[PDB]
Amino acid sequence: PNYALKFTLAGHTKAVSSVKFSPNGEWLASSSADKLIKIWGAYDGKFEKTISGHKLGISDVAWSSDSNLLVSASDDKTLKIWDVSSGKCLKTLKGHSNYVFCCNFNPQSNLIVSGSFDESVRIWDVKTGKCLKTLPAHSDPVSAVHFNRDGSLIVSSSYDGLCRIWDTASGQCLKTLIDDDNPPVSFVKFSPNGKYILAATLDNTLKLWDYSKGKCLKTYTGHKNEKYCIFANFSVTGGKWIVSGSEDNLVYIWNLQTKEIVQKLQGHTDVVISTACHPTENIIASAALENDKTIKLWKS
Ligand SMILES: CC(C)[C@@H](C=O)NC(=O)c1ccc(/N=N/c2ccc(CNC(=O)[C@H](C)NC(=O)[C@H](CCCNC(=N)N)NC(=O)[C@H](C)NC(=O)[C@@H](N)CO)cc2)cc1
């Protein structure tokens, strides 16, 4: 592809931790160590509004599938659910006993899943703000959580070096994925069609799993990732790419099928912690840590 820098989004006063496109494609939401959520135009990069309320820094944010709600995960041990158009905090989700690290809605958006440094995964009711399940998911901080395409499954990852797949409805562990070694797993998510999971590990490696057979199918390397929980992505609006941030301040793009690096995006001045792919255009958002503080929008 030919992604080129179109906009730089400045305004967070500390490290940006996470960026996400709304499912309707109109907006970008960003979370920061500065305790704020910011909302931006997805196409023009224009600053829209700031959403505030958390008492400590925020590590993750996610949209409901109707683009009306956001959920954020905080070091203050809570998640909050926000009505984006009014800026209202609808619910505060209490129950983790350490930093909340990651969060996501299910496609129906009646459930929220969260992962924490308390080594648990929790499943919450959106309408009532109540925790429906706690899963004893891992033996170290939970780095990522994600619903599959129809909400029936959750995948979690942890510093303990495991990916686990869970049944949403019952809370039972359906699968533990483990390879030749178990370096910390720093990120995991389902592929859009639901057949694979992509997992990143702190050994500078991304891995594509066929989780039904339980086998690693592809390996992506060349980037630097030994310390941070960096988001990765399936890019599926154009060519089929894998997109990831990197601790050498670059955005990496890989050919999904052949596994070669097909583009490296330069511009950030600190670790690229988060990338997101626009749901219908060939647009990538990337965000960086404390010495950069900016979000970049790239188009192919
Ligand atoms: C090689 C040897 C030594 C080996 C054996 O011991 N050691 C290791 O494997 C190892 C060593 C150090 C390691 N330390 N890594 C970090 C250290 C400090 C930080 C500080 N935090 C940040 O810089 C940013 C702003 N926050 C984060 O990276 C994460 C959120 C990342 C994106 N979210 C997501 N992927 N779901 N959050 C945090 O680190 C803490 C919990 N929260 C915050 O910082 C909030 N204020 C803002 O996120 C992060 C990672 C990790 C592994």
Residue numbers in the entry: 33 to 332
Task: Tell me what the authors wrote about this structure, in their words.
The C-terminus of MLL1 contains the catalytic SET domain, which is regulated by PPIs within a conserved multi-component complex. It has been shown that binding of WD40-repeat protein 5 (WDR5) to arginine 3765 (R3765) of MLL1 is crucial to enzymatic activity. Herein, we report the design and synthesis of photo-responsive probes based on azobenzene-containing peptides capable of controlling the activity of MLL1 in a reversible manner. These photo-controllable peptidomimetics target the key PPI of the MLL1 core complex: WDR5-MLL1.
We determined the co-crystal structure of this photoswitchable peptiomimetic with WDR5 to understand the interaction at the atomic level. State I refers to the conditions where the cis/trans ratio of 7 was ∼5 : 95 prior to protein complexation, while in state II the cis/trans ratio of 7 was ∼80 : 20 prior to protein complexation. Furthermore, in the latter state the crystallization experiments were performed in the absence of light, and the crystal plates were always kept in the dark. In both cases, the N-terminal part of the peptide –SARA– superimposes well, and the main difference between the two structures comes from the orientation of the azobenzene rings. Remarkably, in both states the trans isomer was the one trapped in the crystal. An interesting feature of the electron density maps of the WDR5-peptide complexes is that the C-terminal part of the peptide reveals static or molecular dynamic disorder, as reflected in the high B-values that indicate thermal displacement of atoms in crystal structures. The overlay of the two structures clearly shows that the N-terminal part of the peptide (–SARA–) maintains similar interactions to the protein, as seen with the WIN peptide. However, from the glutamate onwards the orientation is different. The replacement of the solvent-exposed glutamic acid residue in the parent WIN peptide by the azobenzene ring provides additional stabilization through interaction with Lys259 and Tyr260 of MLL1.
